[model samples]
Target chain A: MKVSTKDKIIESAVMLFNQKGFSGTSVREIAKSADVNVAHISYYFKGKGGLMEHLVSEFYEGYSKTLETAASNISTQSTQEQLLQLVFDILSYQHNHRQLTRFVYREVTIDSTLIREIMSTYLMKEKYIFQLIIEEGEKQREYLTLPLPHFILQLKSLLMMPYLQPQYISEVLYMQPHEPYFYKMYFEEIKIWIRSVFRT
Target chain B: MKVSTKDKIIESAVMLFNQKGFSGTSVREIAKSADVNVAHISYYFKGKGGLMEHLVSEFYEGYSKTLETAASNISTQSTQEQLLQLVFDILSYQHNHRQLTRFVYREVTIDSTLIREIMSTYLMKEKYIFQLIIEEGEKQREYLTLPLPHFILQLKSLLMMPYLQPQYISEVLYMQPHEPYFYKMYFEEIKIWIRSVFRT
Candidate 1:
């Protein structure tokens, strides 16, 4: 798919915000990186804050669509395969949009209003998918028999930790940036770990 | 032991640094929080940067000492017990000095020199202990057949993710700030998770 000019602006803005933080970045810098004029950015997105809101909304939309698609396709696979595939899908999305994920992660702490918005919209949207998965697991008697909320939390933590703690993972694990293969391997192993936590 | 005035200053500085970025915090704020005069901050640590350096150094020192003690006591306990104790010690230290841990975690990304110093002095000092533990696990035919470096990295990721990604944890896990008992419970469960990971 050909990336649109507006998409390019969003991409560049996400990368800048992730690396330099929101206050540290300027519209001109994002425009320069995106190979567009500063006036074009303002014309398209109103301002930097509008650009941030747009990117965040885009993230939530993308995340929700991915989960929904994964859920729809689950009927063809075993429970473990279904879970692993969902995990792999999420990880791939994270890898492709590393900067966007990092920006959102960092912003949640620094911006209370953004956090509240995310909790209400993005987080709530994701939680619905998680709730569905847990209900399915319970029906099949393939889950840990723990409370659904706790199980959802554990699943979320296991999936998110590797990306969120990259520095520790890189230093201690000796991971290189080029090592995309390890992520697949890591996901497979974590699937086993997660299954072990349950009685199945 | 009664906390010294210098320790009070360090604690106050850590809180301020964690809440506000290094550039965001001021010497006057630290002094006010520590209940000392502004000059007393300089008298104890020379200046804000000096105070930051001291906090980092002191934390590194305490971290190293704790690891050394854990190593010394490892032979007296079962492998599971030793591992659990090590995790407990690390968690306990962080719990007691959370502000310092939070400050370092946040500020390390802001300064390259601080990262270099930490990697050289603090990280290098802890290397031997990590290596020793992994080797011991291997000798005991632990289920961790991965390379030593990978295992160590994964272990650190599991431990540090709770604090470094507290917002994610709190949101997903419903972790409350005042719940000290839950911290212990979580750590114990993590110990069990580690055991399962390393089980034959």
Candidate 2:
């Protein structure tokens, strides 16, 4: 199937933005990378800023929806199972969509409207859902009694650090996985870590 | 004593680079910040590339020495004390030198000669010392049997995540300590985490 010009521009933007950062990347460069004319890019996304807005929306759309569905479907299941499924499902989704993950990670360092929008929208929801899951899990007295906010921060650090800092993960830490199920292993490891911390 | 121009440039570079990044910051901007002439930057470091090289060396110097001295100073201490002391010292040093820490972090994503040099030289030494500490800690039979490389990556993530990504640490995580000695508390918390992970 032929990808639309809009889709191509967004894809190329993710690559360039991840590489050179948002301020460093240009509409012309993205156009060249996508093999579209500058005018067509402007026609499609309007400009670089517009492209960023679209990509960020696109990212949060899939990202939030995956976790939201899992969260909403949490009824009559063990809280541990519910929380694990939601966290694991979201992580697996991110691991598969590595490029977007990397792009968002890179963008977080800079103060931008895109990041602000994300935090105020899907990110806030992500935290709320996570808080509900963790708090409910805590009801069993198995999880550590760490402050809800602090634990959320730690969990976010654990989940995002390796995926976001691929340069450090691959180069400094030398954590290259030789198998296709590497992300699955990571998901399980994270699960184990949270379990260990919270276990009675 | 009055600060030397060379040291002043390095200090200012750390601040500006942390705020603006390596590419966004320029020699003239650095000079203005340092209150030195543009020619001084050229004369001392020869150019921006030269300045980066010197700053990186300056960073690795203190960083490596701190760990190196700790590694060498621990001939008779228990494995737990040895490991905890080394980690705490380096972390404390980073807390005090937050600007340089942020600067190095800002530069991590780029593929540059400076980073490659760091990876080959001081960073390599750093990983070695950390590996030694982790290995020795394992001799106590309480430390988690996680793979040495993978453990190093997680430890690095834990150690660096908050300082590197202040946006998350401050904004999302709301980890801002409104009082002094907050870092001391953070240090103790991190130490507790490592001990808990390794404790049998």
Q: Number of the top candidate by DockQ? A: 2
The 10-residue segment with the lowest total lDDT in model 1 chain A: A172-181
For model 2, residues B79-183, the per-residue Cα lDDT tens digits are: 667767777777877777877776665453455676566646765677678777767766667576566665665667767765644344443234442223345
> Mind giving the per-residue lDDT tens digits that candidate 1 earns over A1-200?
98888988988887777765565578999999999889889999899778877887777678777888877865675665676778888877876776776566544235457645755665666667766665676767677645554555556655655545454444433434223335665666567656765676
DockQ of each: 0.22, 0.30
For model 2, the stretches where C-alpha displacement exceeds 4 angstroms are A37-50, A135-147, A164-181, A198-200, B31-47, B134-151, B164-181
Clashing residue pairs in candidate 2 (N, C-alpha, C atoms within 3 angstroms)? A142-A198, A143-A198, A144-A198
A1-200: candidate 2 lDDT, tens digit per residue:
99998888888988878776666678889989999889988898778777777777777788888878867855657667776777787788777777777666555245467656665677567767877776666667657656655566666776776554444445423354222435665667667766655666
Q: When superposed on Cα atoms, how far off is each prediction in RMSD?
A: 5.1, 4.2
TM-score of each model's chain B:
0.82, 0.82
Which residue pairs does candidate 1 place in steric collision? none
